[PDB]
């Protein structure tokens, strides 16, 4: 094998993978239904569950997250696919029960673990319809102490004027992405709103699942793991650049697609706004 998912390939990731930049030094928060330890092409630094039902959380039943985290950084060797930062330290958080949802108390909690546990990169695959001040305190504080968070959203599409963006979404802090294919065109089931801040792939991306193999997800939660990939990896050449900085880094330097409402600002480009 050796195959790589074009997933990134589109953002100029495979690139930096050469110089030596393999997202090393950074820990990434992949808060989701879980990630597999089992998997031959996975390496987990740790984790801790926050909701009492599936309470290792190194067994994932669902694949939302084992898969997400997949695009995050999947072992590089003769095993298949790869991401942005294949050799970052995966932190696996489960705030959901999997094959269902869970409560902001589970969303808010593991995402203060990964921030008050010195996690550099945070990947939040989920979107909520409304959010509180409680969700606004940890997103504001996880962003005020070094962390840079990215969250999903897209699965509600258009509404004319009213925007369809999840929480963490409509707030300033945080950078919510969306899904693109390769045509460099939007996606039907992809969220729009004054908030969209940048855009990545997210459609029929191969990766790894429970059991021992991969499979195909299409959605907007698989896009978020693109950012927070380059994210780890933009902290590669400057283990010492802030949140703020790298914020403008990806955002500062993308490719034009459409209006600041389904398009954001463009696509991910590693070796451009990440230098």
Q: Which residues are annotated as a binding site?
A: 2, 41, 75, 77, 79, 81, 169, 171, 174
- ∠145-91-105 over CA atoms, to 5°? 65
CB-based contact 184:267 (threshold 8 Å): yes
Pick the catalytic residue from 33, 207, 221, 224. 221
For the chain, where are the alpha helices, taking DSSP H only?
6-9, 16-19, 64-72, 104-113, 134-143, 224-234, 243-252
Check whether the bond before 241 is cis (ω within 30° of 0): no
Give me the sign of the Cα torsion angle 23, 28, 32, 33.
Answer: positive
CA distance 233 to 6: 18
Residue carrying structure tokens 């590693």: 270
CATH number of the domain that 76 lies in?
Answer: 3.40.50.200
Range of the domain at 139: 1-275
Strands 205-209 and 213-217: antiparallel
Pairing of strands 205-209, 121-124: unpaired
Q: Which two tokens stand for residue 129?
A: 């319809």
Number of CB atoms found within 10 A of residue 55's CB: 11
Whether 197 sits among the annotated catalytic residues: the reply is no
Method of determination is: X-ray
DSSP at 267 = B
Data resolution in angstroms:
2.8
DSSP string, 145-214: TS-EEEE---SS---TTS----BTTSSSSSEE--EE-SSS---TT---STT---BEE-SSEEEEETTTEE
The number of distinct structural domains making up the chain is: 1
**What residues have CB less than 8 Å from 271, skipping those under 6 apart?**
12, 15, 16
221 belongs to the catalytic site: yes
Of 244, 138, 257, 122, the closest CA to residue 201 belongs to: 257
Q: Which residues make up each annotated binding site for Ca(2+)?
A: 2, 41, 75, 77, 79, 81, 169, 171, 174
Active site residue 64: yes
Q: Name every residue whose Cβ is closer than 8 Å to that of residue 253 and which is 6 or more positions away in sequence.
A: 269, 272, 273, 274
List 39, 64, 67, 226, catalytic entry: 64
């Amino acid at each position: 094998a050796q195959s790589v998912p074009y997933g990134v390939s589109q953002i100029k990731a495979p690139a930096l993978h050469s110089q030596g930049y393999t997202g090393s030094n950074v820990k990434v928060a992949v808060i989701d239904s879980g990630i597999d330890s089992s998997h031959p092409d996975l390496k987990v630094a740790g984790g801790a569950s926050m909701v009492p039902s599936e309470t290792p959380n190194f067994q994932d039943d669902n694949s939302h997250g084992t898969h997400v985290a997949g695009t995050v950084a999947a072992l590089n060797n003769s095993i298949g696919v790869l991401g942005v930062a294949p050799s970052s330290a995966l932190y696996a958080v489960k705030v959901l029960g999997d094959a269902g949802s869970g409560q902001y108390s589970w969303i808010i909690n593991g995402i203060e673990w990964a921030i008050a546990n010195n996690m550099d990169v945070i990947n939040m695959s989920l979107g909520g319809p409304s959010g509180s001040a409680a969700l606004k305190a940890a997103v504001d504080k996880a962003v005020a102490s070094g962390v840079v968070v990215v969250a999903a959203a897209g699965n509600e599409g258009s509404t004319g004027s009213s925007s369809t963006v999840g929480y963490p979404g409509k707030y300033p802090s945080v950078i919510a992405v969306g899904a693109v294919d390769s045509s460099n065109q939007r996606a039907s089931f992809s969220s729009v709103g004054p908030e969209l801040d940048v855009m990545a792939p997210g459609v029929s991306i191969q990766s790894t699942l429970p059991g021992n193999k991969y499979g195909a997800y299409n959605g907007t939660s698989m896009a978020s793991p693109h950012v927070a990939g380059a994210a780890a990896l933009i902290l590669s050449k400057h283990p010492n650049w802030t949140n703020t900085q790298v914020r403008s880094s990806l955002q500062n330097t993308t490719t034009k697609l459409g209006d600041s409402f389904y398009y954001g600002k463009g696509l991910i480009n590693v070796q451009a706004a990440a230098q």
